[PDB]
Design a protein around this ligand. Structure first.
Ligand SMILES: CC(=O)C1=C(O)N2[C@H](C1=O)[C@H]1c3c[nH]c4cccc(c34)C[C@H]1C2(C)C
Ligand SMILES: [K+]
Ligand SMILES: [Mg+2]
Length: 994
C-alpha cells in the first residue's frame, strides 16, 4: 500500500484482509514475507577485504614499474660483482616505493565514510506486532515485520516500517520526524484520511515513517510498506542508483598515465631502432646476452625516468595540509580530493534560514485598526526595538516610545501572542543571556509580549529568571488554555480554545485565538476589531491590511508578517471534533481581525560581502527559502543576490511555478535562476541534475534525509554542524558555524590550493622529462651511462619531492577571486605550457650528459679523451691501441655519474625557484618569499652532501664526492637554466598575453 494515507482505516484493513483485533495469521505472514520481502535494507559488499591494495595495481602506469621491477630483479642477480647488500636494491626500492604509494593510494578507510551504511542505523532491532496466533503483544525482529502487520508503538519506540495509523490509544500522538524534516518540533498525528493521493510526507498526518521515533503517546496501526518501499527506503535507492564520478583532476592524471605509457613504449622501440646497427655485427665478435642486458637496463631506466614516483606522496601530503586549513576556517572536509574540486565550484545553492540568516526572529513592526468609516480606514502601526530574544526593548509609535497597554487593540494583540503559543523563554546564567524554548518564530512572539507589557506588571523588582515568562504568564492567568488546534499547511493557521478564569473578567463565553499566515486568516475574518468595538470586514478595510502586509514583506524591511485574529463566538465544546484535523479550518471561521505582527529573519553579518565576493569570483549563488516568492526576492535584493532595482521576473521561481514548467523550460530556468521559494523536497536534486547538465560544478546545501540524495548527487554536498547525522555522512563538507561565508571562504582556499598544486605537478614532470632526454641521449649516442635508475628514484622521491611539497605553501596569488571558476576539462599542460617544460626538460637532459661528458674529456682530474672514442667505450678490451691511457674501469667511474647527478639536483633547485610563479619573473617575484621553499632547498643539498660523505651511502648510490674544482663547473651549467626560463616567461607575457 503506497497510498495508505489517502485511504481510510477501514479500507487499509480490507486491503490486507486483516482484523484490527486479531492480526495476521501465520499463514498470511508466510505469504506476505515471501512476496514483499523482509523489512530491511540491502547490505553493502566491498569492505576491507584483500581486494584493497590489488586494484591499485590495475592501471598501466603502475604495472610498468611492477614489470620494470621484474626486469631489474633479473639484472640484480646476473652480475660478476661480489658485492653483498647492494645487490638487491634497484628491484627492492622500486618494489618498496610501489607498495608505499599503493598503501597511500588505498586510503579510503579513514578518509571516506559511508552514507547508506549510516542509513541502517534508523531501522530498529525489534518491533511490537499483534499476530493472530497469540493474544498478548509479541515483539519480533524488525526485519520479520511484513506489510499488513498490526503493529503497536509507544513513547520511545523507533518506528520499524511505514505504518498507516489505525487507532490512537493515548490522548495525543507526537512523533519526532527530525531526520525526515530537519526540524525538531514533534508533529501531531491523526487517523482521518489525507484525501490527496499525491500529498507530501509533511501533510501525511496519519502515517508513521520508518526511522521516526514517537516523542509522546501510544498508538496502533497497520503496516503500509516495508524495506525499500518505505520513505527512508526510497531515499536509499536514490542514493544507491547514483554513481559518483571522480574529480576531473584525477581523470587528467589517469589520462596522463596513459599518454606517458605510450611515450615510454615509444622510446623503448626508438632505442631498439637506433640499435639496429648491431644487426650488422659479427656473431663471432661478441655475445647476444651482453646486448640483452643493455636493452633491459635502458628499459627500466626510461620507466623510472619518465614517471614521477613522488607525486602521489606529495599531493596526499598537500591535500592533508589543506584539510587542516579548511578546519581552521570552520569547514570540515570529508574526502581529500574534495579540497581540490572545491576551488572549481561554480554554483552555490544555499538555504536561507540558518546559513544566510542568523535565525534571530524578532518582531520589529506591528499594526492594529484605528478607525473605520466606510472608505476611510486608518491603522495604528508600532515599531519594536531589540533584535534578540531578551525582553530588553521598547515599543514606539512614530519613533516615540508609547505604553502598549493604553491601546485596547494592542492588549488583545499581546493576548493572542501569549496564549496561541507553544514556545517560551528561559534565562541562561552559564552563558549570561536569554535563550529560546521551542520554535524561533513563537519565541519571538513570547519576547514581544514581554516588551509590550499590556497590563503594566512590575519588572525592575523582578529577577532575571522571573523576567523571562513574566508578562506571558499574566496573560495565562486571565484565560485558561483549553486545547490547541495544531498548525497545518492546508489552512496555514493555528488557533487555541480559551476559557475565562473564575474571576468574572467580562468575557463573552469562550474565545478562540487564531494565529496564521495573512492570506488565509484575513479571508476568514468577517469582522474587524477596532479597539474594543467590532465592525464588519469591508472591502476598503481588507485593502489597507493586505497593502501594509505587502509593504512589510516586499519592502526593504523584508518582514515575515503574521495575521492575528480571534473568534468571538466559537462553537460549543461538544460540537467540535478534535480528532478531525480537517474541520479545524471550519472551526476557525467567522473570525475578528485584531492585528498583524511583522518579525525579521536577519541576514548574517558577513554574507553581504561573501555574496559580493562570489560576484567577482564568477560564482553563481542560488538561494533556497521557505518564504513566499515576494519576500524571497526582497531578501535576495537585501543580501546582494539581486540589484536594488534590477529585473528578476524570470530569475526567481516558486516550487509551484517551477513544477508547472515543462522539463525543457525547467532546465532552461536553472541556468538563470538565483532564487527558489517554497521548494518541493524532490526539487533540490532536480536542480542539481539540471545544473550538472551545463557541466556546472554545484555546491548544494542541506541538513536532512530529504536533502541526502541531493547532497550525494551534487559535486560539493554541504551539511551543517547542527544538521542530522545522515546529512553529514552524505556531504563532502560540514560547516562548523553553519555560515554561508565559510562556504565561500573554503572555495577561495580550495582555488589557491589547486593553483599551487598544478605548479609542483609541472615541476616534477619537468624533472622526469629531463631524465628521459638524459637517458635517451646517453643510450642512443652510445655514451657511458650518466644516471642510474637507483639514483633517479631518490631524486624524484626526495630531492624533487621536498621542494615540491614546499611549493604547496606558495603565497596565494592576489586577485584570484577576480577570476572565473577553473574549468572542469581544463588541461594540466598544453600549448605554450608544453613547450615551456619541453625546453627545460630538453636542456637539463643535455646538462647532465654534458656534465659527465665534461669529466670524460675537458676536465682536470679527468683523462684527456675525445668524443669519437668515448662513444666506443664498449671496445676498450677489444680495440686496445685506439683506447689507451689507464684501466677500462675508468669508463665506469663514479665521478662522471656524480657530475650528472649534482647538476640535475642543482638545476631542480633553481627550477623550484622558477615554480614560485607561472609567469611572474624572479625579478618581480623574489626568490626568498617562500621561506618553506628555501628551507626545503637547504635540506635537499644537505642530504645531497649526506649521501656523498657518510661512507655507507655513496657506495650504494655509486657516487664519489667532488671538490671545489668540480663544483664550479656544476654551477656554470646548472644556473643558466634560470636565464633560459626567464626568457620564456618574458615571451609569454609579451607575445602571448592579450
Ligand atoms: C602503485 C600505485 O599505487 C601508485 C604509485 O606507486 N604510482 C602512482 C600510483 O597511483 C602511479 C600513477 C597512476 N597515475 C599517475 C599519474 C601521475 C603519476 C603517477 C601515476 C605515479 C605512478 C606510480 C607508479 C609512481
Ligand atoms: K556528493
Ligand atoms: Mg595508486
Amino acid at each position: 500500500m503506497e497510498a495508505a494515507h489517502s485511504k481510510s482505516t477501514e479500507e487499509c484493513l480490507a486491503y490486507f484482509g486483516v482484523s484490527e483485533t486479531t492480526g495476521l495469521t501465520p499463514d498470511q505472514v508466510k505469504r506476505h514475507l515471501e512476496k514483499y520481502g523482509h523489512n530491511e535494507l540491502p547490505a553493502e559488499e566491498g569492505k576491507s577485504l584483500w581486494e584493497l591494495v590489488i586494484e591499485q595495481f590495475e592501471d598501466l602506469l603502475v604495472r610498468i614499474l611492477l614489470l620494470a621491477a621484474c626486469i631489474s630483479f633479473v639484472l640484480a642477480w646476473f652480475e660478476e660483482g661480489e658485492e653483498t647488500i647492494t645487490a638487491f636494491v634497484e628491484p627492492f626500492v622500486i618494489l618498496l616505493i610501489l607498495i608505499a604509494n599503493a598503501i597511500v593510494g588505498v586510503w579510503q578507510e579513514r578518509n571516506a565514510e559511508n552514507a547508506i551504511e549510516a542509513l541502517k542505523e534508523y531501522e530498529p532491532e525489534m518491533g511490537k506486532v499483534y499476530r493472530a496466533d497469540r493474544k498478548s503483544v509479541q515483539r519480533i525482529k524488525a526485519r520479520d515485520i511484513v506489510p499488513g502487520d498490526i503493529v503497536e508503538v509507544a513513547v520511545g519506540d523507533k518506528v520499524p516500517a511505514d505504518i498507516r495509523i489505525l487507532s490512537i490509544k493515548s490522548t495525543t500522538l507526537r512523533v519526532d520526524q527530525s531526520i525526515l524534516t530537519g526540524e525538531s518540533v514533534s508533529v501531531i498525528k491523526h487517523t482521518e484520511p489525507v484525501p490527496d493521493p499525491r500529498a507530501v510526507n509533511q501533510d501525511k498526518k496519519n502515517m508513521l515513517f520508518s526511522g521516526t521515533n514517537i516523542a509522546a503517546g501510544k498508538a496502533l496501526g497497520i503496516v503500509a510498506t516495508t524495506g525499500v518501499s518505505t520513505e527512508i527506503g526510497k531515499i536509499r535507492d536514490q542514493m544507491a542508483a547514483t554513481e559518483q564520478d571522480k574529480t576531473p583532476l584525477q581523470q587528467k592524471l589517469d589520462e596522463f598515465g596513459e599518454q606517458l605509457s605510450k611515450v615510454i613504449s615509444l622510446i623503448c622501440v626508438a632505442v631498439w631502432l637506433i640499435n639496429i646497427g648491431h644487426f650488422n655485427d659479427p656473431v663471432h665478435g661478441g655475445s647476444w646476452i651482453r646486448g640483452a642486458i643493455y636493452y633491459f637496463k635502458i628499459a627500466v631506466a626510461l620507466a623510472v625516468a619518465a614517471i614521477p614516483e613522488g607525486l602521489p606522496a606529495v599531493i596526499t601530503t598537500c591535500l592533508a595540509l589543506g584539510t587542516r586549513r579548511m578546519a581552521k576556517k570552520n569547514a570540515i572536509v570529508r574526502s581529500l580530493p574534495s579540497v581540490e574540486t572545491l576551488g572549481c565550484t561554480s554554483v552555490i545553492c544555499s538555504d536561507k534560514t540558518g546559513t544566510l540568516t542568523t535565525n534571530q526572529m524578532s518582531v520589529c513592526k506591528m499594526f492594529i485598526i484605528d478607525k473605520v468609516d466606510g472608505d476611510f480606514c486608518s491603522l495604528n502601526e508600532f515599531s519594536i526595538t531589540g533584535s534578540t530574544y531578551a525582553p530588553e526593548g521598547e515599543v514606539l509609535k512614530n519613533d516615540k516610545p508609547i505604553r502598549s497597554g493604553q491601546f485596547d487593540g494592542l492588549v488583545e494583540l499581546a493576548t493572542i501572542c501569549a496564549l496561541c503559543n507553544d514556545s517560551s523563554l528561559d534565562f541562561n546564567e552559564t552563558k549570561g543571556v536569554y535563550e529560546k524554548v521551542g520554535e524561533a518564530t513563537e519565541t519571538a512572539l513570547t519576547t514581544l509580549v514581554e516588551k509590550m507589557n499590556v497590563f503594566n506588571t512590575e519588572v525592575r523588582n523582578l529577577s532575571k529568571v522571573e523576567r523571562a515568562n513574566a508578562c506571558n504568564s499574566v496573560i495565562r492567568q486571565l484565560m485558561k488554555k483549553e486545547f490547541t488546534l495544531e498548525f497545518s499547511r492546508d489552512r496555514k493557521s493555528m488557533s487555541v480554545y480559551c476559557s475565562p478564569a473564575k474571576s468574572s473578567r467580562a468575557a463573552v463565553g469562550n474565545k478562540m485565538f487564531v494565529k496564521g499566515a495573512p492570506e488565509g486568516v484575513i479571508d476568514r475574518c468577517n469582522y474587524v476589531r477596532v479597539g474594543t468595538t467590532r465592525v464588519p470586514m469591508t472591502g476598503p478595510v481588507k485593502e489597507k491590511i493586505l497593502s501594509v502586509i505587502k509593504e512589510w514583506g516586499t519592502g526593504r524591511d523584508t518582514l515575515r508578517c503574521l495575521a492575528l485574529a480571534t473568534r468571538d463566538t466559537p462553537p460549543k465544546r461538544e460540537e467540535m471534533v478534535l480528532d478531525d484535523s480537517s474541520r479545524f479550518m471550519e472551526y476557525e471561521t467567522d473570525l475578528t481581525f485584531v492585528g498583524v505582527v511583522g518579525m525579521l529573519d536577519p541576514p548574517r553579518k558577513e554574507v553581504m560581502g561573501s555574496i559580493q565576493l562570489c560576484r567577482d569570483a564568477g560564482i553563481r549563488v542560488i538561494m533556497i527559502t521557505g518564504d513566499n516568492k515576494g519576500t524571497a526576492i526582497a531578501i535576495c535584493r537585501r543580501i546582494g543576490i539581486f540589484g536594488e532595482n534590477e529585473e528578476v521576473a524570470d530569475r526567481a521561481y516558486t516550487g509551484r511555478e517551477f513544477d508547472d514548467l515543462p522539463l525543457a523550460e525547467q532546465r532552461e530556468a536553472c541556468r538563470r535562476a538565483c532564487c527558489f521559494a517554497r521548494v518541493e523536497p524532490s526539487h533540490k536534486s532536480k536542480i542539481v541534475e539540471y545544473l550538472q547538465s551545463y557541466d556546472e560544478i554545484t555546491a548544494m546545501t542541506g541538513d536532512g534525509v530529504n536533502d541526502a540524495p541531493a547532497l550525494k548527487k551534487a559535486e560539493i554536498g554541504i551539511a551543517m554542524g547542527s544538521g542530522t547525522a545522515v546529512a553529514k555522512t552524505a556531504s563532502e563538507m560540514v560547516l562548523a558555524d553553519d555560515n554561508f561565508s565559510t562556504i565561500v571562504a573554503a572555495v577561495e582556499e580550495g582555488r589557491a590550493i589547486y593553483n599551487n598544486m598544478k605548479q609542483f605537478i609541472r615541476y616534477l614532470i619537468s624533472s622526469n622529462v629531463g631524465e628521459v632526454v638524459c637517458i635517451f641521449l646517453t643510450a642512443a649516442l652510445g655514451l657511458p651511462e650518466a644516471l642510474i635508475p637507483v639514483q633517479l628514484l631518490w631524486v624524484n622521491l626526495v630531492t624533487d619531492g621536498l621542494p615540491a611539497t614546499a611549493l604547496g605553501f606558495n603565497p596565494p596569488d592576489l586577485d584570484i577571486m577576480d577570476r572565473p571558476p577553473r574549468s572542469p576539462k581544463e588541461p594540466l599542460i598544453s600549448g605554450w605550457l608544453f613547450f615551456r617544460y619541453m625546453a627545460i626538460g630538453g636542456y637539463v637532459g643535455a646538462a647532465t650528459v654534458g656534465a659527465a661528458a665534461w669529466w670524460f674529456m675537458y676536465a682536470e682530474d679527468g683523462p684527456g679523451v675525445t668524443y669519437h672514442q668515448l662513444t666506443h667505450f664498449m671496445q676498450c678490451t677489444e680495440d686496445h691501441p685506439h683506447f689507451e691511457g689507464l684501466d677500462c674501469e675508468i669508463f665506469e667511474a663514479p665521478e662522471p655519474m656524480t657530475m650528472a647527478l649534482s647538476v640535475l639536483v642543482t638545476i631542480e633547485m633553481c627550477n623550484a625557484l622558477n615554480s614560485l610563479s607561472e609567469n611572474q619573473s624572479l625579478m618581480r617575484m623574489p626568490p626568498w618569499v617562500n621561506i618553506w621553499l628555501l628551507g626545503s632547498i637547504c635540506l635537499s643539498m644537505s642530504l645531497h652532501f649526506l649521501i656523498l660523505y657518510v661512507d655507507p651511502l655513496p657506495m650504494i648510490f655509486k657516487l664519489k664526492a667532488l671538490d671545489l674544482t668540480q663544483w664550479l663547473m656544476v654551477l656554470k651549467i646548472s644556473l643558466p637554466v634560470i636565464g633560459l626560463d626567464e626568457i620564456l616567461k618574458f615571451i609569454a607575457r609579451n607575445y602571448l598575453e592579450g
